Amino acid sequence: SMNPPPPETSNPNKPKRQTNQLQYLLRVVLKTLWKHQFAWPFQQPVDAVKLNLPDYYKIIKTPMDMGTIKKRLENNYYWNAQECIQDFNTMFTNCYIYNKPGDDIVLMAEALEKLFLQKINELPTEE
């Protein structure tokens, strides 16, 4: 029932790059999802205490959220676009695993994911 520490967003010894694909992931992909009317539940780690989801972190062992992704991208945490794409996919999948089809939170995830897919379809070729 307690919350875990959040995912890492800072690690000085992890090598880092700022690729044009990673810039796209921030400027197009994160910004488009972040502004959406359905973003709010996804903008920070799931607070299993406030939300009274005491089993959340029993089920979800690789937590992810857009607040985390935002810090990673703003802090140039990543080496490549694929790491960041994986974070988005983890966030969506966790929601689907934890919840039931047609739950409001799942409809919200699906809307965000549709947009995510449309944007990732136009990921630019690496400069």
Interaction site with ligand 25O (CB under 6 A): 41-42, 46, 51, 53, 95, 98-99, 105
Q: At its nearest, how many Å lie between ligand 25O and the CB of residue 25?
A: 19
Q: At its nearest, how many Å lie between ligand 25O and the CB of residue 42?
A: 5
Choose between 3 and 19: whose C-beta lies nearer to ligand 25O.
3
Q: Which residue is nearest to ligand 25O (CB)?
A: 41
Q: How far apart are CA 80 and CA 87, in angstroms?
A: 12
Radius of gyration of the chain (CA): 15
